[PDB]
């Protein structure tokens, strides 16, 4: 019996929501308490860069953006369930981390 905390940080939002739905379904499949999703804000990584090369023309700026979403869940699991929920719970690009205490 241990007590872990998994943090899912990604930008493909519905892949995030689907892996968190997988996690909450596996957590209710053998319930821990309920420990539903805790939802951090959208960190917005905005860059403003000139559209123009070497400088002739009207001055234009594009604000390219990245939209990062962080979520995390506590769990009260055994170590074998920890290994399964770090291994068979995988997806492209979705950063998954399990911090223990």
């Amino acid at each position: 019996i241990i007590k872990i905390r998994i943090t899912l940080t990604s930008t493909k939002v519905k892949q995030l929501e689907n892996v968190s739905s997988n996690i909450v379904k596996n957590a209710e499949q053998h319930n821990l308490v309920k420990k539903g999703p805790v939802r951090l804000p959208t960190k917005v990584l905005k860059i403003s860069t000139r559209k123009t090369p070497n400088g002739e023309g009207s001055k234009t700026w594009e604000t390219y953006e990245m939209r990062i979403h962080k979520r995390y869940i506590d769990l009260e699991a055994p170590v074998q369930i920890v290994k399964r929920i770090t291994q068979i719970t995988i997806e492209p690009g979705v950063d998954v981390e399990v911090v223990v205490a």
Binding site: S58, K59, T60, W61
Partner: protein, 141 residues
């Protein structure tokens, strides 16, 4: 079960929470009374709903409002909107419908919307000018 209710007013960023409980009559913002928050030239603007409705109804409600955001002006507008909403939400939930609607119509027949959130938000700054719609002056020659 200590029949309280929490409501909320919202200016452009000044967001106030309003706690209303069945009490003795104290109206407080940031722990001090509303008579001791000091823009002082909007003091009658926050005095508006109380002496609007005639103060002998406030004797059984204690209200405490906390505001985050904005400036002095928008915080006074946030607290007056929030305690007026809390008054009419009390008179909806805990006493009669027509008392709620009577205070509601007496607020509508003066209102600066007074129980309604204003949709006025600041437009972004567009590039090419230090104003939101202003631009930098040009030379032509």
């Amino acid at each position: 079960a200590v029949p309280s209710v929490q409501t909320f007013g919202k200016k452009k960023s000044a967001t106030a929470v309003a706690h209303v409980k069945a009490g003795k009559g104290l109206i407080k913002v940031n722990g001090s009374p509303i008579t001791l928050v000091e823009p002082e030239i909007l003091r009658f603007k926050v005095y508006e709903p109380l002496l609007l409705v005639g103060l002998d109804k406030f004797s059984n409600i204690d209200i405490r409002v906390r505001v985050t955001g904005g400036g002095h002006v928008s915080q006074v507008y946030a607290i007056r909107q929030a305690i007026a909403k809390g008054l009419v939400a009390y008179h909806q939930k805990y006493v009669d419908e027509q008392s709620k609607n009577e205070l509601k119509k007496a607020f509508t027949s003066y209102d600066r919307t007074l129980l309604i959130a204003d949709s006025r938000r600041p437009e972004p700054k567009k590039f090419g000018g230090k104003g939101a719609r202003s631009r930098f002056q040009k030379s032509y020659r």
